[PDB]
Design a protein around this ligand. Sequence first.
Ligand SMILES: NC(=O)C1=CN([C@@H]2O[C@H](COP(=O)(O)OP(=O)(O)OC[C@H]3O[C@@H](n4cnc5c(N)ncnc54)[C@H](OP(=O)(O)O)[C@@H]3O)[C@@H](O)[C@H]2O)C=CC1
Ligand SMILES: NC(=O)C1=CN([C@@H]2O[C@H](COP(=O)(O)OP(=O)(O)OC[C@H]3O[C@@H](n4cnc5c(N)ncnc54)[C@H](OP(=O)(O)O)[C@@H]3O)[C@@H](O)[C@H]2O)C=CC1
Ligand SMILES: CN(Cc1cnc2nc(N)nc(N)c2n1)c1ccc(C(=O)N[C@@H](CCC(=O)O)C(=O)O)cc1
Ligand SMILES: CN(Cc1cnc2nc(N)nc(N)c2n1)c1ccc(C(=O)N[C@@H](CCC(=O)O)C(=O)O)cc1
Lengths: 166, 166
Amino acid sequence: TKKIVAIWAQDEEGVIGKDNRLPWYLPAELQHFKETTLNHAILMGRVTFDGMGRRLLPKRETLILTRNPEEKIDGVATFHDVQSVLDWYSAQEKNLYIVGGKQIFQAFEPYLDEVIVTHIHARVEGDTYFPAEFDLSLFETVSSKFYTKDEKNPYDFTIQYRKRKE
Amino acid sequence: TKKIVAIWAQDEEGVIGKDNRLPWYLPAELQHFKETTLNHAILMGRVTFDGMGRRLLPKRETLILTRNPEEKIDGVATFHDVQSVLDWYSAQEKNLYIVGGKQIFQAFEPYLDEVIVTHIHARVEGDTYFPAEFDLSLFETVSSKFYTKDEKNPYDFTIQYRKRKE
Ligand SMILES: NC(=O)C1=CN([C@@H]2O[C@H](COP(=O)(O)OP(=O)(O)OC[C@H]3O[C@@H](n4cnc5c(N)ncnc54)[C@H](OP(=O)(O)O)[C@@H]3O)[C@@H](O)[C@H]2O)C=CC1
Ligand SMILES: NC(=O)C1=CN([C@@H]2O[C@H](COP(=O)(O)OP(=O)(O)OC[C@H]3O[C@@H](n4cnc5c(N)ncnc54)[C@H](OP(=O)(O)O)[C@@H]3O)[C@@H](O)[C@H]2O)C=CC1
Ligand SMILES: CN(Cc1cnc2nc(N)nc(N)c2n1)c1ccc(C(=O)N[C@@H](CCC(=O)O)C(=O)O)cc1
Ligand SMILES: CN(Cc1cnc2nc(N)nc(N)c2n1)c1ccc(C(=O)N[C@@H](CCC(=O)O)C(=O)O)cc1
Protein backbone atom coordinates (compact mmCIF):
# COMPACT_ATOMS: atom_id res chain seq x y z
CA THR A 1 0.00 0.00 0.00
CA LYS A 2 2.74 2.49 0.97
CA LYS A 3 4.73 4.10 -1.82
CA ILE A 4 6.98 6.95 -2.84
CA VAL A 5 5.39 8.96 -5.62
CA ALA A 6 6.87 11.81 -7.62
CA ILE A 7 4.39 14.43 -8.77
CA TRP A 8 5.00 17.42 -10.98
CA ALA A 9 3.56 19.60 -13.71
CA GLN A 10 5.40 20.60 -16.89
CA ASP A 11 4.78 22.47 -20.11
CA GLU A 12 5.10 20.90 -23.60
CA GLU A 13 8.90 21.19 -23.51
CA GLY A 14 9.52 20.02 -19.95
CA VAL A 15 9.51 23.45 -18.29
CA ILE A 16 8.76 23.25 -14.58
CA GLY A 17 10.10 26.52 -13.18
CA LYS A 18 11.14 30.16 -13.59
CA ASP A 19 12.58 32.52 -10.97
CA ASN A 20 12.00 30.01 -8.16
CA ARG A 21 8.29 29.75 -9.00
CA LEU A 22 6.05 28.13 -11.63
CA PRO A 23 5.67 29.91 -14.99
CA TRP A 24 1.87 29.55 -14.99
CA TYR A 25 -1.12 29.59 -12.66
CA LEU A 26 -3.80 26.92 -12.84
CA PRO A 27 -5.94 26.67 -9.66
CA ALA A 28 -7.56 23.52 -11.01
CA GLU A 29 -4.15 21.84 -11.27
CA LEU A 30 -3.29 22.97 -7.72
CA GLN A 31 -6.63 21.47 -6.64
CA HIS A 32 -5.50 18.15 -8.12
CA PHE A 33 -2.23 18.48 -6.19
CA LYS A 34 -4.13 19.13 -2.97
CA GLU A 35 -6.46 16.13 -3.37
CA THR A 36 -3.57 13.79 -4.19
CA THR A 37 -1.32 14.81 -1.29
CA LEU A 38 -3.99 15.54 1.35
CA ASN A 39 -3.38 13.70 4.67
CA HIS A 40 0.03 12.48 3.44
CA ALA A 41 3.67 13.62 3.53
CA ILE A 42 5.38 15.76 0.88
CA LEU A 43 9.11 16.28 0.39
CA MET A 44 10.25 19.43 -1.42
CA GLY A 45 13.62 21.11 -1.79
CA ARG A 46 14.42 24.13 0.39
CA VAL A 47 14.44 26.36 -2.73
CA THR A 48 10.92 25.38 -3.79
CA PHE A 49 9.66 25.92 -0.18
CA ASP A 50 11.06 29.46 -0.10
CA GLY A 51 9.74 29.84 -3.65
CA MET A 52 6.16 29.37 -2.39
CA GLY A 53 6.64 31.91 0.41
CA ARG A 54 7.27 29.22 2.99
CA ARG A 55 3.53 28.48 3.06
CA LEU A 56 2.53 25.43 5.06
CA LEU A 57 -0.11 23.40 3.16
CA PRO A 58 -2.90 22.34 5.55
CA LYS A 59 -3.29 18.62 6.28
CA ARG A 60 0.09 17.94 4.65
CA GLU A 61 3.11 16.62 6.59
CA THR A 62 5.77 18.93 5.09
CA LEU A 63 9.34 17.65 4.85
CA ILE A 64 12.11 19.95 3.66
CA LEU A 65 15.37 18.73 2.14
CA THR A 66 18.38 21.06 2.71
CA ARG A 67 22.11 20.97 3.43
CA ASN A 68 21.77 23.90 5.84
CA PRO A 69 22.38 22.51 9.38
CA GLU A 70 20.91 25.64 10.99
CA GLU A 71 17.84 25.62 8.82
CA LYS A 72 14.82 25.42 11.11
CA ILE A 73 11.24 26.25 10.10
CA ASP A 74 8.44 25.68 12.56
CA GLY A 75 5.64 23.49 11.24
CA VAL A 76 7.99 21.39 9.11
CA ALA A 77 10.56 18.61 9.54
CA THR A 78 14.03 19.23 8.09
CA PHE A 79 16.16 16.55 6.39
CA HIS A 80 19.77 16.87 5.27
CA ASP A 81 20.21 13.88 2.98
CA VAL A 82 18.30 11.26 1.04
CA GLN A 83 19.12 8.32 3.35
CA SER A 84 17.58 10.27 6.22
CA VAL A 85 14.31 10.64 4.32
CA LEU A 86 14.26 7.00 3.31
CA ASP A 87 14.72 5.93 6.93
CA TRP A 88 11.87 8.27 7.95
CA TYR A 89 9.71 6.81 5.18
CA SER A 90 10.32 3.22 6.25
CA ALA A 91 9.48 4.05 9.88
CA GLN A 92 5.96 5.18 8.99
CA GLU A 93 2.96 4.20 6.87
CA LYS A 94 1.81 7.27 4.92
CA ASN A 95 2.62 7.49 1.20
CA LEU A 96 5.44 9.98 0.50
CA TYR A 97 5.10 12.43 -2.39
CA ILE A 98 8.25 13.96 -3.91
CA VAL A 99 6.82 17.34 -4.78
CA GLY A 100 9.50 19.31 -6.39
CA GLY A 101 12.53 21.18 -7.30
CA LYS A 102 14.46 19.59 -10.14
CA GLN A 103 17.31 18.55 -7.74
CA ILE A 104 14.86 16.80 -5.47
CA PHE A 105 13.28 14.94 -8.40
CA GLN A 106 16.79 13.85 -9.50
CA ALA A 107 17.81 12.72 -6.01
CA PHE A 108 14.75 10.50 -5.52
CA GLU A 109 14.45 8.95 -8.99
CA PRO A 110 15.90 5.56 -7.92
CA TYR A 111 13.30 5.15 -5.17
CA LEU A 112 10.13 6.07 -7.07
CA ASP A 113 7.19 3.60 -7.12
CA GLU A 114 5.07 5.84 -9.33
CA VAL A 115 4.80 9.26 -10.99
CA ILE A 116 1.76 11.51 -11.41
CA VAL A 117 2.60 13.97 -14.19
CA THR A 118 0.57 16.88 -15.43
CA HIS A 119 1.25 17.76 -19.08
CA ILE A 120 0.29 21.40 -19.60
CA HIS A 121 -0.67 22.01 -23.20
CA ALA A 122 1.24 25.23 -23.61
CA ARG A 123 4.73 26.57 -24.18
CA VAL A 124 6.12 29.04 -21.64
CA GLU A 125 9.56 30.47 -20.85
CA GLY A 126 11.36 28.80 -17.96
CA ASP A 127 14.87 28.47 -16.52
CA THR A 128 14.33 25.06 -14.90
CA TYR A 129 13.17 21.87 -16.63
CA PHE A 130 12.18 18.39 -15.42
CA PRO A 131 15.43 16.25 -15.43
CA ALA A 132 15.97 15.33 -19.07
CA GLU A 133 18.01 12.26 -18.00
CA PHE A 134 15.09 10.96 -15.93
CA ASP A 135 14.12 7.59 -17.39
CA LEU A 136 10.35 7.72 -17.80
CA SER A 137 10.41 4.46 -19.81
CA LEU A 138 10.50 2.36 -16.65
CA PHE A 139 6.97 3.60 -16.00
CA GLU A 140 3.61 2.73 -17.53
CA THR A 141 0.47 4.85 -17.77
CA VAL A 142 -2.25 3.34 -15.55
CA SER A 143 -4.78 6.17 -15.94
CA SER A 144 -5.20 9.79 -17.07
CA LYS A 145 -7.68 12.62 -17.46
CA PHE A 146 -8.03 15.64 -19.73
CA TYR A 147 -8.92 18.99 -18.13
CA THR A 148 -10.43 21.57 -20.51
CA LYS A 149 -9.18 25.16 -20.06
CA ASP A 150 -11.53 27.90 -18.89
CA GLU A 151 -11.51 31.46 -17.50
CA LYS A 152 -9.51 30.58 -14.39
CA ASN A 153 -7.31 27.87 -16.03
CA PRO A 154 -6.14 29.34 -19.34
CA TYR A 155 -4.26 26.21 -20.52
CA ASP A 156 -5.65 22.74 -21.14
CA PHE A 157 -3.72 20.04 -19.25
CA THR A 158 -3.66 16.29 -18.82
CA ILE A 159 -2.78 14.31 -15.71
CA GLN A 160 -1.19 10.84 -16.09
CA TYR A 161 -0.69 8.26 -13.31
CA ARG A 162 2.17 5.92 -14.21
CA LYS A 163 3.41 2.98 -12.17
CA ARG A 164 6.83 1.39 -12.32
CA LYS A 165 6.87 -1.45 -14.85
CA GLU A 166 7.53 -4.84 -13.18
CA THR B 1 10.03 65.63 -10.19
CA LYS B 2 10.54 62.99 -7.47
CA LYS B 3 7.31 61.40 -6.30
CA ILE B 4 5.52 58.65 -4.43
CA VAL B 5 3.93 56.19 -6.83
CA ALA B 6 1.57 53.25 -6.20
CA ILE B 7 1.78 50.41 -8.66
CA TRP B 8 -0.42 47.32 -8.72
CA ALA B 9 -2.27 44.85 -10.86
CA GLN B 10 -5.91 43.78 -10.38
CA ASP B 11 -8.60 41.73 -12.15
CA GLU B 12 -11.96 43.10 -13.29
CA GLU B 13 -13.37 42.88 -9.74
CA GLY B 14 -10.37 44.43 -7.99
CA VAL B 15 -8.82 41.08 -6.98
CA ILE B 16 -5.11 41.50 -6.18
CA GLY B 17 -4.35 38.34 -4.21
CA LYS B 18 -5.14 34.74 -3.26
CA ASP B 19 -3.38 32.57 -0.68
CA ASN B 20 -0.67 35.22 -0.36
CA ARG B 21 0.22 35.23 -4.07
CA LEU B 22 -1.16 36.83 -7.27
CA PRO B 23 -3.89 34.71 -8.90
CA TRP B 24 -2.38 34.82 -12.36
CA TYR B 25 0.96 34.72 -14.17
CA LEU B 26 1.81 37.28 -16.83
CA PRO B 27 5.51 37.64 -17.63
CA ALA B 28 4.83 40.74 -19.70
CA GLU B 29 3.16 42.38 -16.71
CA LEU B 30 6.07 41.41 -14.46
CA GLN B 31 8.47 42.86 -17.07
CA HIS B 32 6.40 46.07 -16.89
CA PHE B 33 6.78 46.06 -13.10
CA LYS B 34 10.55 45.75 -13.40
CA GLU B 35 10.86 48.50 -16.01
CA THR B 36 8.83 50.88 -13.81
CA THR B 37 10.67 50.32 -10.52
CA LEU B 38 14.18 49.52 -11.80
CA ASN B 39 16.92 51.65 -10.11
CA HIS B 40 14.47 53.03 -7.56
CA ALA B 41 13.19 52.11 -4.14
CA ILE B 42 10.21 49.84 -3.52
CA LEU B 43 8.19 49.53 -0.33
CA MET B 44 6.27 46.30 0.40
CA GLY B 45 4.58 44.95 3.51
CA ARG B 46 6.35 42.14 5.39
CA VAL B 47 3.56 39.74 4.33
CA THR B 48 4.21 40.26 0.64
CA PHE B 49 7.98 40.13 1.21
CA ASP B 50 7.50 36.68 2.80
CA GLY B 51 5.06 35.79 0.02
CA MET B 52 7.75 36.10 -2.60
CA GLY B 53 10.31 34.08 -0.65
CA ARG B 54 12.19 37.14 0.60
CA ARG B 55 13.57 37.22 -2.96
CA LEU B 56 15.54 40.47 -3.29
CA LEU B 57 14.92 42.00 -6.73
CA PRO B 58 17.97 43.25 -8.68
CA LYS B 59 18.80 46.91 -9.23
CA ARG B 60 16.15 47.88 -6.70
CA GLU B 61 16.37 49.26 -3.19
CA THR B 62 13.95 47.18 -1.10
CA LEU B 63 12.16 48.72 1.89
CA ILE B 64 10.09 46.57 4.23
CA LEU B 65 7.30 47.85 6.50
CA THR B 66 6.60 45.78 9.65
CA ARG B 67 5.71 46.10 13.35
CA ASN B 68 8.23 43.37 14.14
CA PRO B 69 10.74 44.89 16.65
CA GLU B 70 13.59 43.57 14.48
CA GLU B 71 15.89 46.49 13.57
CA LYS B 72 16.78 44.88 10.26
CA ILE B 73 16.07 41.95 7.94
CA ASP B 74 18.00 41.06 4.77
CA GLY B 75 19.79 43.30 2.32
CA VAL B 76 16.78 45.54 2.90
CA ALA B 77 15.89 48.55 5.08
CA THR B 78 13.34 47.98 7.86
CA PHE B 79 10.68 50.58 8.77
CA HIS B 80 8.19 50.42 11.61
CA ASP B 81 5.50 52.92 10.62
CA VAL B 82 4.26 55.00 7.69
CA GLN B 83 5.84 58.29 8.80
CA SER B 84 9.27 56.62 8.99
CA VAL B 85 9.07 55.70 5.30
CA LEU B 86 7.89 59.17 4.25
CA ASP B 87 10.82 60.76 6.16
CA TRP B 88 13.32 58.39 4.54
CA TYR B 89 11.70 59.30 1.19
CA SER B 90 12.06 63.02 1.91
CA ALA B 91 15.79 62.65 2.67
CA GLN B 92 16.62 61.21 -0.74
CA GLU B 93 15.97 61.88 -4.42
CA LYS B 94 14.68 58.65 -5.92
CA ASN B 95 11.02 57.97 -6.66
CA LEU B 96 9.35 55.69 -4.13
CA TYR B 97 7.17 52.85 -5.41
CA ILE B 98 4.54 51.41 -3.06
CA VAL B 99 4.34 47.89 -4.49
CA GLY B 100 2.12 45.80 -2.49
CA GLY B 101 0.13 44.26 0.15
CA LYS B 102 -3.45 45.55 0.54
CA GLN B 103 -2.53 47.06 3.96
CA ILE B 104 0.53 48.85 2.54
CA PHE B 105 -1.44 50.27 -0.39
CA GLN B 106 -4.09 51.53 2.00
CA ALA B 107 -1.49 53.09 4.30
CA PHE B 108 0.18 55.18 1.59
CA GLU B 109 -2.85 56.22 -0.43
CA PRO B 110 -3.02 59.71 1.12
CA TYR B 111 0.54 60.50 0.03
CA LEU B 112 0.44 59.19 -3.51
CA ASP B 113 1.49 61.50 -6.39
CA GLU B 114 0.65 58.93 -9.06
CA VAL B 115 -0.78 55.47 -9.62
CA ILE B 116 0.22 52.96 -12.31
CA VAL B 117 -2.59 50.38 -12.40
CA THR B 118 -2.69 47.29 -14.60
CA HIS B 119 -6.26 46.27 -15.42
CA ILE B 120 -6.24 42.51 -16.17
CA HIS B 121 -9.26 41.80 -18.31
CA ALA B 122 -10.36 38.63 -16.57
CA ARG B 123 -12.19 37.36 -13.49
CA VAL B 124 -10.25 35.09 -11.12
CA GLU B 125 -10.75 33.97 -7.53
CA GLY B 126 -9.20 36.27 -4.93
CA ASP B 127 -9.33 36.64 -1.11
CA THR B 128 -7.65 40.08 -1.20
CA TYR B 129 -9.00 43.16 -2.99
CA PHE B 130 -7.39 46.49 -3.71
CA PRO B 131 -8.38 48.94 -0.90
CA ALA B 132 -10.20 51.44 -3.08
CA GLU B 133 -10.63 54.33 -0.62
CA PHE B 134 -9.34 56.79 -3.18
CA ASP B 135 -11.31 59.81 -4.29
CA LEU B 136 -10.69 58.90 -7.97
CA SER B 137 -11.82 62.45 -8.79
CA LEU B 138 -8.43 63.53 -7.35
CA PHE B 139 -6.48 61.83 -10.16
CA GLU B 140 -6.40 62.24 -13.93
CA THR B 141 -5.54 59.45 -16.37
CA VAL B 142 -2.60 60.70 -18.41
CA SER B 143 -2.62 57.58 -20.53
CA SER B 144 -3.14 53.84 -20.77
CA LYS B 145 -1.85 51.19 -23.21
CA PHE B 146 -3.21 47.80 -24.16
CA TYR B 147 -1.35 44.48 -24.22
CA THR B 148 -3.04 41.78 -26.29
CA LYS B 149 -2.97 38.24 -24.91
CA ASP B 150 -0.67 35.56 -26.28
CA GLU B 151 0.59 32.08 -25.41
CA LYS B 152 2.64 33.21 -22.40
CA ASN B 153 0.24 35.96 -21.24
CA PRO B 154 -3.28 34.37 -21.41
CA TYR B 155 -5.18 37.54 -20.38
CA ASP B 156 -5.40 40.92 -22.12
CA PHE B 157 -4.45 43.80 -19.79
CA THR B 158 -4.31 47.60 -19.86
CA ILE B 159 -1.75 49.67 -17.97
CA GLN B 160 -3.11 53.05 -16.88
CA TYR B 161 -1.00 55.97 -15.67
CA ARG B 162 -2.85 58.45 -13.44
CA LYS B 163 -1.50 61.62 -11.79
CA ARG B 164 -2.91 63.68 -8.91
CA LYS B 165 -4.53 66.78 -10.45
CA GLU B 166 -4.86 70.36 -9.18
N1 LIG C 1 6.35 22.46 -11.99
C1 LIG C 1 6.38 21.72 -10.89
O1 LIG C 1 5.70 20.72 -10.71
C2 LIG C 1 7.37 22.19 -9.82
C3 LIG C 1 8.29 23.19 -10.12
N2 LIG C 1 9.22 23.60 -9.15
C4 LIG C 1 10.18 24.68 -9.44
O2 LIG C 1 11.51 24.17 -9.62
C5 LIG C 1 12.44 25.21 -9.23
C6 LIG C 1 13.24 24.70 -8.03
O3 LIG C 1 14.07 23.61 -8.43
P1 LIG C 1 15.59 23.55 -7.91
O4 LIG C 1 16.24 24.83 -8.27
O5 LIG C 1 16.18 22.30 -8.44
O6 LIG C 1 15.41 23.55 -6.31
P2 LIG C 1 14.84 22.37 -5.39
O7 LIG C 1 13.44 22.67 -5.03
O8 LIG C 1 15.14 21.04 -5.97
O9 LIG C 1 15.73 22.56 -4.07
C7 LIG C 1 17.16 22.54 -4.10
C8 LIG C 1 17.72 22.53 -2.68
O10 LIG C 1 17.38 21.30 -2.02
C9 LIG C 1 18.46 20.99 -1.12
N3 LIG C 1 19.13 19.76 -1.59
C10 LIG C 1 19.23 19.33 -2.85
N4 LIG C 1 19.82 18.13 -2.85
C11 LIG C 1 20.08 17.81 -1.59
C12 LIG C 1 20.63 16.69 -0.96
N5 LIG C 1 20.98 15.63 -1.67
N6 LIG C 1 20.73 16.69 0.38
C13 LIG C 1 20.32 17.72 1.11
N7 LIG C 1 19.79 18.79 0.55
C14 LIG C 1 19.66 18.86 -0.78
C15 LIG C 1 19.42 22.18 -1.18
O11 LIG C 1 18.90 23.16 -0.28
P3 LIG C 1 19.86 24.21 0.47
O12 LIG C 1 20.41 25.15 -0.71
O13 LIG C 1 19.13 24.95 1.51
O14 LIG C 1 21.12 23.42 1.06
C16 LIG C 1 19.25 22.57 -2.65
O15 LIG C 1 19.67 23.92 -2.86
C17 LIG C 1 11.59 26.42 -8.83
O16 LIG C 1 11.31 27.24 -9.98
C18 LIG C 1 10.32 25.72 -8.33
O17 LIG C 1 9.19 26.58 -8.40
C19 LIG C 1 9.22 22.98 -7.89
C20 LIG C 1 8.30 21.98 -7.61
C21 LIG C 1 7.37 21.59 -8.57
N1 LIG D 1 -1.73 42.28 -7.25
C1 LIG D 1 -0.78 43.12 -6.87
O1 LIG D 1 -0.42 44.10 -7.54
C2 LIG D 1 -0.17 42.81 -5.51
C3 LIG D 1 -0.82 41.91 -4.67
N2 LIG D 1 -0.25 41.57 -3.44
C4 LIG D 1 -0.94 40.60 -2.56
O2 LIG D 1 -1.53 41.22 -1.40
C5 LIG D 1 -1.70 40.18 -0.41
C6 LIG D 1 -0.98 40.68 0.84
O3 LIG D 1 -1.63 41.86 1.34
P1 LIG D 1 -1.67 42.08 2.94
O4 LIG D 1 -2.18 40.82 3.54
O5 LIG D 1 -2.41 43.33 3.21
O6 LIG D 1 -0.11 42.17 3.33
P2 LIG D 1 0.89 43.43 3.12
O7 LIG D 1 1.84 43.03 2.05
O8 LIG D 1 0.16 44.71 3.00
O9 LIG D 1 1.70 43.40 4.52
C7 LIG D 1 1.08 43.68 5.78
C8 LIG D 1 2.15 43.77 6.87
O10 LIG D 1 2.91 44.98 6.76
C9 LIG D 1 3.23 45.42 8.09
N3 LIG D 1 2.43 46.64 8.36
C10 LIG D 1 1.22 46.93 7.88
N4 LIG D 1 0.87 48.15 8.30
C11 LIG D 1 1.87 48.62 9.04
C12 LIG D 1 2.10 49.82 9.72
N5 LIG D 1 1.20 50.80 9.69
N6 LIG D 1 3.26 49.98 10.37
C13 LIG D 1 4.19 49.04 10.38
N7 LIG D 1 4.01 47.89 9.75
C14 LIG D 1 2.87 47.66 9.08
C15 LIG D 1 2.77 44.32 9.05
O11 LIG D 1 3.81 43.35 9.11
P3 LIG D 1 4.12 42.49 10.43
O12 LIG D 1 2.87 41.49 10.56
O13 LIG D 1 5.42 41.78 10.30
O14 LIG D 1 4.10 43.46 11.71
C16 LIG D 1 1.54 43.83 8.27
O15 LIG D 1 1.19 42.51 8.68
C17 LIG D 1 -1.01 38.93 -0.96
O16 LIG D 1 -1.97 38.06 -1.56
C18 LIG D 1 -0.04 39.50 -1.99
O17 LIG D 1 0.15 38.59 -3.08
C19 LIG D 1 0.97 42.13 -3.04
C20 LIG D 1 1.60 43.04 -3.88
C21 LIG D 1 1.04 43.37 -5.11
C1 LIG E 1 4.71 25.93 -5.96
N1 LIG E 1 4.00 24.86 -5.66
C2 LIG E 1 4.44 23.65 -5.96
C3 LIG E 1 3.81 22.93 -6.97
C4 LIG E 1 2.75 23.46 -7.70
N2 LIG E 1 2.03 22.68 -8.50
C5 LIG E 1 2.33 21.38 -8.63
N3 LIG E 1 1.62 20.57 -9.43
C6 LIG E 1 1.94 19.28 -9.56
N4 LIG E 1 1.20 18.48 -10.32
N5 LIG E 1 2.99 18.76 -8.91
C7 LIG E 1 3.74 19.52 -8.09
N6 LIG E 1 4.83 19.04 -7.50
C8 LIG E 1 3.41 20.86 -7.93
N7 LIG E 1 4.13 21.64 -7.11
C9 LIG E 1 2.83 24.98 -5.02
C10 LIG E 1 2.31 26.23 -4.72
C11 LIG E 1 1.07 26.35 -4.12
C12 LIG E 1 0.33 25.21 -3.81
C13 LIG E 1 -1.05 25.35 -3.16
O1 LIG E 1 -1.45 26.46 -2.80
N8 LIG E 1 -1.74 24.23 -3.07
C14 LIG E 1 -3.06 24.14 -2.43
C15 LIG E 1 -4.22 23.95 -3.42
C16 LIG E 1 -4.63 25.20 -4.19
C17 LIG E 1 -5.97 24.98 -4.91
O2 LIG E 1 -6.77 24.16 -4.40
O3 LIG E 1 -6.18 25.63 -5.95
C18 LIG E 1 -3.02 22.91 -1.52
O4 LIG E 1 -3.72 22.93 -0.49
O5 LIG E 1 -2.27 21.98 -1.89
C19 LIG E 1 0.85 23.95 -4.09
C20 LIG E 1 2.09 23.84 -4.70
C1 LIG F 1 4.53 39.14 -6.07
N1 LIG F 1 5.09 40.19 -6.65
C2 LIG F 1 4.58 41.40 -6.46
C3 LIG F 1 3.87 42.00 -7.50
C4 LIG F 1 3.68 41.33 -8.71
N2 LIG F 1 3.20 41.96 -9.76
C5 LIG F 1 2.90 43.26 -9.69
N3 LIG F 1 2.44 43.93 -10.76
C6 LIG F 1 2.14 45.24 -10.67
N4 LIG F 1 1.79 45.90 -11.77
N5 LIG F 1 2.30 45.91 -9.52
C7 LIG F 1 2.76 45.29 -8.43
N6 LIG F 1 2.95 45.96 -7.30
C8 LIG F 1 3.07 43.94 -8.49
N7 LIG F 1 3.56 43.30 -7.42
C9 LIG F 1 6.19 40.06 -7.38
C10 LIG F 1 6.71 38.79 -7.64
C11 LIG F 1 7.78 38.64 -8.51
C12 LIG F 1 8.36 39.76 -9.11
C13 LIG F 1 9.55 39.61 -10.06
O1 LIG F 1 10.06 38.51 -10.26
N8 LIG F 1 9.92 40.73 -10.66
C14 LIG F 1 11.08 40.81 -11.57
C15 LIG F 1 10.69 40.64 -13.04
C16 LIG F 1 10.40 39.17 -13.37
C17 LIG F 1 10.01 38.94 -14.83
O2 LIG F 1 10.23 39.86 -15.64
O3 LIG F 1 9.49 37.84 -15.10
C18 LIG F 1 11.73 42.17 -11.34
O4 LIG F 1 12.98 42.23 -11.41
O5 LIG F 1 10.97 43.11 -11.05
C19 LIG F 1 7.86 41.03 -8.83
C20 LIG F 1 6.78 41.17 -7.97
